[PDB]
C-alpha cells in the first residue's frame, strides 16, 4: 500500500515538473467571456463569475491590475501563483482553465466553485461536529502530502481560503504565498491566527508550518473559534509562542491528543515533521475511521452539500459594488509580466 503512494507521488512530481518548466500562456482572451457578478475583491485583484460565450460554461476569473501589483510589490507572488496553478493536479486544488493578459490586467480563469468559502458556513453554523471537521481535515492532509511532495509550502491555510464545491468537497484556490523550496525559508507571511511560532519568532522555517496551520484549522472548525485570538495580532503572537492552549470541554480525547501534537511549539516533536512524516497524522486515532483512498477518490458522502440552484448561482457569495474592467490604451508594466 505504501508502494502505491510512492509510485503515485513519483508520477505526480514528473507531471508537475514538466508543466512547471514549460508553463501555458495566452489560452483565451477577455471578449470570450461575459461578466456576471463580482465574487470577491481585495488588494490588487477581483474575482468575478463569468460565462464563456462560445460554450456557456461558467468560470471564476481572477483579474489583477498590473500597476497595483507592481505598486504593492507582488510581481513574483503573482507570477508564481499562476505558474503553480497551471502545473499542479490534485482533486482538492482548483483547476486553472485559461490565463491571458492585456494592456492593464492579468487574468486567471478557474473552475467556478459555487458553494462558497468554508468561512461563511462555519460562522453561520457556529461550529462543525468532529466527523464533519475530520472530513475536511482529511482532504487538507492529502493536499499537503501532495504539495509537500512537490517541495511546495502552502503558508495560507484558513477557512477564508477553502471553497466548498457542489459535492461538498474542498477546493484550495490561493497560491500567492506558496513557495517551492526544499530547505528553509524566512518570509514573514500568513494570517496572524494561523502563524506557526517559528514564523513569529523570525526563525528560518520549513513545511512544518503547514502542519501547525492544520492544527489551527482543525481546532477552529471543531470549536467555532481559533485556538489563539486577541484584540491585536501582537497579543495573538504572544499566545501562539507561549506553548499553552485550552480546549473546549466537548473536544474528544483523540481530538485533543492530535491537536497537542500538531500545535506543538517544539519542531522536533510536531506531527508531520517527524521521521514517519504525514503517516503520524494519517494513523492517529482521531483518523481511525478515515478511508484515505475513498476520500481521495471522492467516494465518501459529504456531511454538508451547499445550496446550488443551477449553473451561475451565486447565493453562497457576498454582494460587492460592481466596477468597470478598464483596459488602458497604453500597455502597462510589460517587461515585468512577460512570463505570465
Amino acid at each position: 500500500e505504501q508502494e502505491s503512494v510512492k509510485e503515485f507521488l513519483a508520477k505526480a512530481k514528473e507531471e508537475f515538473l514538466k508543466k512547471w518548466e514549460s508553463p501555458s500562456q495566452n489560452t483565451a482572451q477577455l471578449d470570450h467571456f461575459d461578466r456576471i457578478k463580482t465574487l470577491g475583491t481585495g488588494s490588487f485583484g477581483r474575482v468575478m463569475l463569468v460565462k464563456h460565450k462560445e460554450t456557456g460554461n461558467h468560470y471564476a476569473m481572477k483579474i489583477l491590475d498590473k500597476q497595483k501589483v507592481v505598486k504593492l510589490k507582488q510581481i513574483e507572488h503573482t507570477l508564481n501563483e499562476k505558474r503553480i496553478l497551471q502545473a499542479v493536479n490534485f482533486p482538492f486544488l482548483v483547476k486553472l482553465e485559461f490565463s491571458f493578459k492585456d494592456n492593464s490586467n492579468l487574468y486567471m480563469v478557474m473552475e467556478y466553485v459555487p458553494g462558497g468559502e468554508m468561512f461563511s458556513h462555519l460562522r453561520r453554523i457556529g461550529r462543525f461536529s468532529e466527523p464533519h471537521a475530520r472530513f475536511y481535515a482529511a482532504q487538507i492532509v492529502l493536499t499537503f502530502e501532495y504539495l509537500h511532495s512537490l517541495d511546495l509550502i502552502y503558508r495560507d491555510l484558513k477557512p477564508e481560503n477553502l471553497l466548498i464545491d457542489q459535492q461538498g468537497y474542498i477546493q484550495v484556490t490561493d497560491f500567492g504565498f506558496a513557495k517551492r523550496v526544499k530547505g528553509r525559508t524566512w518570509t514573514l507571511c500568513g494570517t496572524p491566527e494561523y502563524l506557526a511560532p517559528e514564523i513569529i519568532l523570525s526563525k528560518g522555517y520549513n513545511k512544518a508550518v503547514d502542519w501547525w496551520a492544520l492544527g489551527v484549522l482543525i481546532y477552529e472548525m471543531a470549536a467555532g473559534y481559533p485556538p489563539f485570538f486577541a484584540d491585536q495580532p501582537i497579543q495573538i503572537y504572544e499566545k501562539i509562542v507561549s506553548g499553552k492552549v485550552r480546549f473546549p470541554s466537548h473536544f474528544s480525547s483523540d481530538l485533543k491528543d492530535l491537536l497537542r501534537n500538531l500545535l506543538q511549539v517544539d519542531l522536533t516533536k510536531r506531527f508531520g515533521n517527524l521521521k514517519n512524516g504525514v503517516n503520524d497524522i494519517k494513523n492517529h486515532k482521531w483518523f481511525a475511521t478515515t478511508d484515505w483512498i475513498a476520500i481521495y477518490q471522492r467516494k465518501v458522502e459529504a456531511p454538508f452539500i451547499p445550496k446550488f440552484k443551477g449553473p451561475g448561482d451565486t447565493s453562497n457569495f457576498d454582494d460587492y459594488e460592481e466596477e468597470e474592467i478598464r483596459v488602458s490604451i497604453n500597455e502597462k508594466c510589460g517587461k515585468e509580466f512577460t512570463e505570465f
Partner: peptide, 18 residues
C-alpha cells in the same frame, strides 16, 4: 466564556494576511 472572548476580540470577520 471563551466564545464571548472571541466575539469581544473583534476578529470574527474574514481575516487578512499580514
Amino acid at each position: 466564556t471563551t466564545y464571548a472572548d472571541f466575539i469581544a476580540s473583534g476578529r470574527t470577520g474574514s481575516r487578512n494576511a499580514i
